[PDB]
Amino acid sequence: LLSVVGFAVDLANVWRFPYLCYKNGGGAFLIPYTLFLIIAGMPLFYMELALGQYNREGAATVWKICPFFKGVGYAVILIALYVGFYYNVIIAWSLYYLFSSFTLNLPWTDCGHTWNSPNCTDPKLSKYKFTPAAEFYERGVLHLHESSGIHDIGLPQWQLLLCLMVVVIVLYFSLWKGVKVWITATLPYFVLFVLLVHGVTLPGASNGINAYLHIDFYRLKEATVWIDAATQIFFSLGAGFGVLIAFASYNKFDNNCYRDALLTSSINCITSFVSGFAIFSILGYMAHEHKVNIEDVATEGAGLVFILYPEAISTLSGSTFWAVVFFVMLLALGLDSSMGGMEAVITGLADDFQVLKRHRKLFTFGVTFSTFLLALFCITKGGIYVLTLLDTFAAGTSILFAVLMEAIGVSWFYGVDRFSNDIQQMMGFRPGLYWRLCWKFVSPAFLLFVVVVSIINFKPLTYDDYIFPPWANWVGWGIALSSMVLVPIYVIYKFLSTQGSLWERLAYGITPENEHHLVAQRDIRQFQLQHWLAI
Numbered sequence: 206l207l208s209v210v211g212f213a214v215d216l217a218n219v220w221r222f223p224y225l226c227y228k229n230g231g232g233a234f235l236i237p238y239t240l241f242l243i244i245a246g247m248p249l250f251y252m253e254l255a256l257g258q259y260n261r262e263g264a265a266t267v268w269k270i271c272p273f274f275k276g277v278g279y280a281v282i283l284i285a286l287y288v289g290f291y292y293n294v295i296i297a298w299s300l301y302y303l304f305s306s307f308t309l310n311l312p313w314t315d316c317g318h319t320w321n322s323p324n325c326t327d328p329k330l331s332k333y334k335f336t337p338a339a340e341f342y343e344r345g346v347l348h349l350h351e352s353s354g355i356h357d358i359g360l361p362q363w364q365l366l367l368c369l370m371v372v373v374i375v376l377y378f379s380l381w382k383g384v385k386v387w388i389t390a391t392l393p394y395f396v397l398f399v400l401l402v403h404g405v406t407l408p409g410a411s412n413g414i415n416a417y418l419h420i421d422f423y424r425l426k427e428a429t430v431w432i433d434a435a436t437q438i439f440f441s442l443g444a445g446f447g448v449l450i451a452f453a454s455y456n457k458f459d460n461n462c463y464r465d466a467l468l469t470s471s472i473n474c475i476t477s478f479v480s481g482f483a484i485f486s487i488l489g490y491m492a493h494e495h496k497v498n499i500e501d502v503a504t505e506g507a508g509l510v511f512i513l514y515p516e517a518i519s520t521l522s523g524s525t526f527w528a529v530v531f532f533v534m535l536l537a538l539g540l541d542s543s544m545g546g547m548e549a550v551i552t553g554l555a556d557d558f559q560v561l562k563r564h565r566k567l568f569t570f571g572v573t574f575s576t577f578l579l580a581l582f583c584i585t586k587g588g589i590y591v592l593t594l595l596d597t598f599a600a601g602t603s604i605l606f607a608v609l610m611e612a613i614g615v616s617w618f619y620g621v622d623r624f625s626n627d628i629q630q631m632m633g634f635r636p637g638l639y640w641r642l643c644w645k646f647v648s649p650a651f652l653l654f655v656v657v658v659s660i661i662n663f664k665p666l667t668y669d670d671y672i673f674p675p676w677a678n679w680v681g682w683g684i685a686l687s688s689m690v691l692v693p694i695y696v697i698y699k700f701l702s703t704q705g706s707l708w709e710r711l712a713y714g715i716t717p718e719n720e721h722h723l724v725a726q727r728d729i730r731q732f733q734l735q736h737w738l739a740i
């Protein structure tokens with residue numbers, strides 16, 4: 206019953222939300238987060254679920270309702286493929302930490318090991334990169350010290366190569382035949398609650414809680430926090446990768462997508478809040494232990510959780526049991542999230558091409574073995590730089606633009622009243638005025654604003670104290686545009702491939718393929734003002 210908390214929690218909420226929150230202060234990130242969850246996240250979540258469940262198609266072939274928008278399905282499939290590259294490397298880190306967490310002297314506790322620089326500092330006898338946990342993550346896991354930047358990235362690390370190989374083999378044998386246990390669905394919440402309890406009882410964590418609950422508004426005057434919050438909203442819920450549409454493809458018709466959207470968004474909100482709470486309790490405790498400030502006590506990159514959660518584990522009694530339990534939780538959660546993403550990709554491209562649906566094993570090998578070879582850039586010596594580049598640009602302005610185009614193609618060109626009648630046929634009740642106003646007007650306007658301020662207010666990409674070269678930002682914007690350009694390219698392809706006059710081309714591009722016999726009789730809904738004045 207209610208296998209929804211095992212979809213409402215994913216590696217985003219527990220790995221990416223921590224550093225996005227910490228990077229943007231305390232609750233100054235939580236105000237835009239819940240705002241976008243109320244006006245944009247939940248409406249588009251419910252819209253994607255209803256679309257997939259009604260049309261019975263994946264992310265690419267759901268756009269037979271307005272053919273000019275299939276480029277958006279291609280774009281979200283490419284977003285998912287881009288995210289998988291650096292997303293399986295986080296699972297490789299999880300597996301390496303789980304393998305290293307089977308000793309009784311955890312390697313992130315003392316710093317008399319071999320991966321330690323002569324500049325270590327121990328609070329048991331600061332610059333937040335000379336601590337045993339940070340020096341284990343950077344030099345004992347990543348081997349980042351052997352890399353001068355993103356230009357000088359070495360060869361893929363051997364042991365991380367083994368971990369990534371295991372991860373990719375597991376993903377293949379999970380996805381090679383199946384169309385897709387509850388303990389791996391409730392263990393995230395158990396671990397998060399244990400961590401919350403210990404964090405609130407930690408010494409020095411009151412300061413972290415005060416810093417987390419403190420809402421500074423000069424940070425809200427700027428635009429970085431809003432773009433971060435929007436991107437995290439569409440990264441956590443999954444709207445923008447084709448995962449919700451591909452998973453609703455297999456739902457029953459009478460399934461209540463409304464209550465699933467409501468409950469998933471609510472669990473996501475409370476889970477992210479409790480996750481930030483635990484994270485900042487650990488951060489306050491770390492600032493107390495290392496005798497520094499909370500603002501410069503840890504990294505603001507993707508490896509923040511691999512320094513925070515080991516540091517909290519190192520305090521609990523029986524630290525090895527909790528290390529093993531936490532990293533099994535993280536590994537299983539990441540594996541489920543990656544199964545979801547790769548199954549979104551495979552379902553989209555297999556409902557699009559029937560030869561890809563017939564050869565499920567070969568196509569799964571092609572999708573998995575390609576994200577393995579391209580994840581070899583993120584497991585190099587300077588692969589944290591490639592992972593930062595991808596995390597910044599693979600799902601950035603791209604996913605916002607993609608969900609904006611989904612909302613537009615469903616609300617304005619397909620019809621929001623047509624979509625509402627579809628939903629009323631599926632479940633039995635019209636969505637409601639709040640939902641239609643968010644689908645048609647509110648969510649598209651906010652998404653357009655965020656995309657525009659994301660393109661016009663763009664900060665150059667940096668790691669902790671390392672500035673990426675300009676060509677790195679050019680490469681990142683090329684990665685972001687490789688998906689945002691699929692929509693106009695498909696519009697121009699579908700326009701230059703439809704026989705007929707200009708108006709017949711427009712009609713055939715905006716009319717669902719199920720009703721392409723109407724254009725012959727010149728009966729097009731979108732060509733009347735009544736269609737666009739439907740609220």
Ligand SMILES: *[C@@H]1O[C@H](CO)[C@@H](O)[C@H](O)[C@H]1NC(C)=O
Pocket residue numbers: 322323324
């Ligand atoms: C350690 O600190 C010294 C400062 O005297 C510096 O010269 C050296 O490069 C540092 N080694 C590292 C960061 O590995």
Ligand SMILES: N=C(N)NCc1cccc(I)c1
Pocket residue numbers: 215217284285286288289290292293439440441442443444446448542543544545546547
């Ligand atoms: N659960 C969310 N929101 N994302 C998970 C995800 C997305 C794209 C690709 C992969 I691999 C995994």
